[PDB]
Amino acid sequence: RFTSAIIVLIVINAIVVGMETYPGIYQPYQDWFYLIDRMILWVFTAEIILKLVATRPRYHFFKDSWNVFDFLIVASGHLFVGAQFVTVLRVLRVLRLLRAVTVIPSLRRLVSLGNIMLLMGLIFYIFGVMGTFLFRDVAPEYFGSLHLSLITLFQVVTLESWASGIMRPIMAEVFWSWIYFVAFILVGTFVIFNLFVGVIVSNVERAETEDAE
Amino acid sequence: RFTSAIIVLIVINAIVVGMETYPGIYQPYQDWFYLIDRMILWVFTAEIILKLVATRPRYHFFKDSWNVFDFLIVASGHLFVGAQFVTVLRVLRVLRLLRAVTVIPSLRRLVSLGNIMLLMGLIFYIFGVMGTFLFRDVAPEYFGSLHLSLITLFQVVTLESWASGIMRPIMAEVFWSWIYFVAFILVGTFVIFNLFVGVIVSNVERAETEDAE
Amino acid sequence: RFTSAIIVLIVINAIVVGMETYPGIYQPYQDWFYLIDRMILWVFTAEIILKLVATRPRYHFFKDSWNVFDFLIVASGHLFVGAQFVTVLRVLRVLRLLRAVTVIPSLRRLVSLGNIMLLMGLIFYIFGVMGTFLFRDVAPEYFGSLHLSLITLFQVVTLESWASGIMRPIMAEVFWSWIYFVAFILVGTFVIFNLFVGVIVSNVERAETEDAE
Amino acid sequence: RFTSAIIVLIVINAIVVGMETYPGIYQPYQDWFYLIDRMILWVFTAEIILKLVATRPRYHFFKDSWNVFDFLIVASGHLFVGAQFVTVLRVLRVLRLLRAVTVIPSLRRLVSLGNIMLLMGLIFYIFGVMGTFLFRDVAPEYFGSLHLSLITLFQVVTLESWASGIMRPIMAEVFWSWIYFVAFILVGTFVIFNLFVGVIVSNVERAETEDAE
């Protein structure tokens, strides 16, 4: 019943945080949700404390990642409303909704690429700098800076409005721009496909390892 | 021949409902399709009744989901044209075209995510509220409300016009907006891929279970 | 050498057809490509005839689909330039480039859904008619007609500009329009994924059947 | 330590090339990065030379593709700043960042379609020419030329703004244009899916061959 009680509050406070967003609800029942917040934080501190002793020596609790998360989460919520950064700590309190992941199984269940990731990162950097020198002057919004180039090239990998929005217009100035992007799309696309082809093989392999165990 | 006769009418009435849409056809042969509708509903009531007795004791019919569906469908079509909600019941009559699914096999053949679905739902809620507070004032159409945020964030997951349509314009006001969406896209995208990676493993597993049976 | 000779011409005439497109090239070497066309058609008729006798009794040739294709293709190209439909037959001549598929292996190599396809078709028809009645008046371009609805709903399945281009604007008039499309997208998307999940299982199964053979 | 030393410089020069992009940084520390470039090129020439002798007889070095790449890369960087094409050789120097791929394993690890690729290429050519004759006059930007048609048809395969951006507008002039594109999309899409269905089967097969070895 302990866990169920906690999971319940999480959902309850979770829905309340959404109500706290509405400026309207805030005028009438501003305090009501305010107090309920103080109450939940308290019950959670008590919960955390209990768990601490029960975990085994207090140490073990600090060993578990899920527990430490719940600890840190509650800690931030504990910090007085006022503070150097009243707002940030105030907003980070919403992170407690993440408690839902820890408290309930399965979710945690769901929650080998580095190599390819690094290669791709290198690729983006290369084309990012090249693109900047190639279209920054004429297209300052997209290619103006290295960071602007990074974001635009990420947009093209997602293939969102790459032609109509980016390439077609750029071709007006530079007819050969297609030479730059088509190849980029091919390489980027190709890697992504292989990446997936690799994640699933490791997936199926895990299934077999599971049967062995 | 009984089933074939029924499947035939379904297709016939199915094509007629499409004709009933055209205001033009309505003027000339309005009545012709009108009468054909009354006739089909009748033959279907007779059909349903027959099935009821044949199913075994009348009970069994009420046991089958496909049969109950056909029952409820026909029932709605039975309700007099006029009624409190003449229109709704009148439009719901089109649901009888769904009879095609029940009557013919295979279709029914085609017709383990909850966990991930819940996690994602939680995620959208979190970002939905955050986005509302972050861009609602400046971007009332997209972020104005919690529900508006939900729809816009769903659009970005589909990756449709996220950059050109949403992000680029939002960056004008908030340059850091990219920090909010890129991460969102990664998380959302990542889950989706894993979700698929899981549905297919359960799929292939079913294939093996089938051979065992 | 016979086949190689034929494959060569195909590629040669194939490149020529592309040149025949340019109005410029047409002025200078209009005749040159014109004559080369007559020559190739002739050599192909001779080829077809030879094959006919060689196939075994002439009959067998008419048994093979690839051969009949090549036959029909050449036949159309044989029809005099002038005719009732000088243009159509003239343009259909380009179909001979398809000879490349027949003549060369592998291509033919590359070149269980019906059930789902039918279900989906039914689905589109249902929503197509519903959409027409729902937004045709206000949105005649997209929903104006049943066929217009079909094309727009196909666009949304491809997920191309569904929100920014279609849904967002439609919401201006109808705020609940999202209720109609989101569900549509889910159903359509879901089926597509399962469809793929099925094509690949049949694919892998074929691989195993191949090893058995 | 030798390799680590080299991998380090690569990353260091890699970050410097990105700084060399900024016109601002260029004014203050233009020379500083300039000299560091000369120094790295030197250490790399020495590196290449050492490897040459160590490879076994100098020959073997010239046998390895990775080594030859590193050789050619450095060679271009060696060419004096000034030259017939001062700029091109100057820009190609960035290719040395590719050294990262050679020097570090894994990347190289990541780095059976021809048949389908050829078929698709043929397909694009066919539709490319047809599209040109069909919409070039009215739509010169998209269909104006054979090459313009190629790029636009590639855009539609990516499914980016095909309807809203291309098809819808084209329908204004030609209502039947949908007949041309829908089929194109189906064929192109279908092949792509099968292509993937084939790459992964070869992938999984390699996994099995690996266990055999």
Short mmCIF file of C-alpha atoms in Angstrom, two decimals, chain B residues 72-196:
data_model
loop_
_atom_site.label_atom_id
_atom_site.label_comp_id
_atom_site.label_asym_id
_atom_site.label_seq_id
_atom_site.Cartn_x
_atom_site.Cartn_y
_atom_site.Cartn_z
CA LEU B 72 -25.26 -2.61 -32.53
CA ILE B 73 -24.48 -1.29 -36.01
CA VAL B 74 -27.83 -2.41 -37.41
CA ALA B 75 -29.61 -1.20 -34.27
CA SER B 76 -28.42 2.37 -34.79
CA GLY B 77 -29.48 2.17 -38.41
CA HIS B 78 -32.85 0.98 -37.16
CA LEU B 79 -33.49 4.10 -35.09
CA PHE B 80 -35.99 6.25 -36.97
CA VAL B 81 -34.51 8.99 -39.14
CA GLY B 82 -36.10 11.53 -36.84
CA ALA B 83 -35.02 11.57 -33.19
CA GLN B 84 -33.43 13.85 -30.61
CA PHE B 85 -30.26 13.67 -32.67
CA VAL B 86 -31.62 12.87 -36.11
CA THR B 87 -28.30 13.76 -37.70
CA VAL B 88 -25.81 11.91 -35.50
CA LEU B 89 -27.70 8.61 -35.61
CA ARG B 90 -28.24 9.32 -39.30
CA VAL B 91 -24.50 9.71 -39.88
CA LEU B 92 -23.52 6.81 -37.61
CA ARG B 93 -25.47 4.59 -39.99
CA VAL B 94 -22.38 4.68 -42.22
CA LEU B 95 -20.74 2.54 -39.54
CA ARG B 96 -22.51 -0.41 -41.18
CA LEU B 97 -19.82 -0.29 -43.85
CA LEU B 98 -17.65 -1.71 -41.07
CA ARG B 99 -19.76 -4.84 -41.50
CA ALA B 100 -17.34 -5.57 -44.33
CA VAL B 101 -14.66 -6.26 -41.73
CA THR B 102 -16.82 -8.72 -39.80
CA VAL B 103 -18.39 -10.55 -42.74
CA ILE B 104 -15.14 -11.12 -44.62
CA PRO B 105 -12.20 -13.01 -43.06
CA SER B 106 -8.59 -11.85 -43.38
CA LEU B 107 -9.51 -8.24 -42.58
CA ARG B 108 -10.21 -9.39 -39.04
CA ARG B 109 -6.85 -11.18 -39.11
CA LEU B 110 -4.96 -7.92 -39.50
CA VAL B 111 -6.97 -5.90 -37.01
CA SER B 112 2.99 -4.67 -25.28
CA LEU B 113 3.21 -0.91 -25.84
CA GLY B 114 1.27 0.42 -22.85
CA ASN B 115 4.43 0.77 -20.77
CA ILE B 116 6.28 2.88 -23.34
CA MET B 117 3.04 4.61 -24.30
CA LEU B 118 2.57 5.75 -20.71
CA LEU B 119 6.16 6.97 -20.47
CA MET B 120 5.78 8.94 -23.69
CA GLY B 121 2.47 10.36 -22.51
CA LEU B 122 4.17 11.54 -19.34
CA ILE B 123 6.94 13.05 -21.45
CA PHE B 124 4.53 14.99 -23.65
CA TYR B 125 2.71 16.28 -20.59
CA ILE B 126 5.97 17.51 -19.06
CA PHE B 127 7.19 19.28 -22.19
CA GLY B 128 3.66 20.39 -22.96
CA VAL B 129 3.43 22.40 -19.76
CA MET B 130 7.02 23.64 -20.07
CA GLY B 131 6.45 24.75 -23.64
CA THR B 132 3.27 26.56 -22.66
CA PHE B 133 5.13 28.63 -20.07
CA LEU B 134 8.02 29.15 -22.47
CA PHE B 135 6.32 30.28 -25.69
CA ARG B 136 2.58 30.65 -25.05
CA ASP B 137 2.66 34.44 -24.72
CA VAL B 138 4.65 35.08 -27.90
CA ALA B 139 3.31 32.05 -29.77
CA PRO B 140 -0.35 31.73 -28.67
CA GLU B 141 -1.37 29.70 -31.73
CA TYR B 142 1.15 26.93 -31.05
CA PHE B 143 1.95 27.22 -27.34
CA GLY B 144 -0.96 29.37 -26.17
CA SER B 145 -2.56 26.54 -24.21
CA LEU B 146 -1.66 23.15 -22.78
CA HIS B 147 -3.76 21.48 -25.46
CA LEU B 148 -2.26 23.69 -28.16
CA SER B 149 1.18 22.68 -26.92
CA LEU B 150 0.17 19.03 -27.05
CA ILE B 151 -0.81 19.27 -30.70
CA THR B 152 2.26 21.27 -31.71
CA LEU B 153 4.61 18.87 -29.92
CA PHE B 154 2.88 16.00 -31.67
CA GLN B 155 3.54 17.77 -34.95
CA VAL B 156 7.24 18.01 -34.15
CA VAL B 157 7.42 14.29 -33.33
CA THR B 158 5.99 13.57 -36.77
CA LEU B 159 8.80 15.90 -37.79
CA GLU B 160 6.43 17.83 -40.05
CA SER B 161 7.55 21.43 -40.59
CA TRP B 162 9.17 21.45 -37.16
CA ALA B 163 12.14 23.59 -38.21
CA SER B 164 10.88 25.84 -41.00
CA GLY B 165 7.38 26.12 -39.60
CA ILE B 166 7.91 26.06 -35.83
CA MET B 167 11.50 26.24 -34.55
CA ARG B 168 13.05 28.73 -36.99
CA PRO B 169 10.30 31.32 -36.35
CA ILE B 170 10.39 30.73 -32.60
CA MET B 171 14.16 31.24 -32.59
CA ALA B 172 13.60 34.80 -33.79
CA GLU B 173 12.19 35.56 -30.34
CA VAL B 174 14.09 32.88 -28.44
CA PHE B 175 17.48 31.89 -29.83
CA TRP B 176 17.80 29.06 -27.29
CA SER B 177 14.54 27.42 -28.36
CA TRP B 178 16.65 24.87 -30.25
CA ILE B 179 17.86 23.55 -26.90
CA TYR B 180 14.26 22.67 -26.05
CA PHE B 181 13.25 20.97 -29.30
CA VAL B 182 16.39 19.13 -30.43
CA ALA B 183 16.50 17.15 -27.18
CA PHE B 184 12.76 16.58 -27.42
CA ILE B 185 13.14 15.23 -30.95
CA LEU B 186 15.98 12.94 -29.91
CA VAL B 187 14.11 11.45 -26.95
CA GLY B 188 10.85 11.09 -28.85
CA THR B 189 12.58 9.69 -31.93
CA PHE B 190 14.70 7.29 -29.88
CA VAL B 191 11.68 5.81 -28.10
CA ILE B 192 9.76 5.36 -31.35
CA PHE B 193 12.63 3.41 -32.85
CA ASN B 194 12.93 1.16 -29.81
CA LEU B 195 9.16 0.73 -29.79
CA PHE B 196 9.35 -0.63 -33.32
#
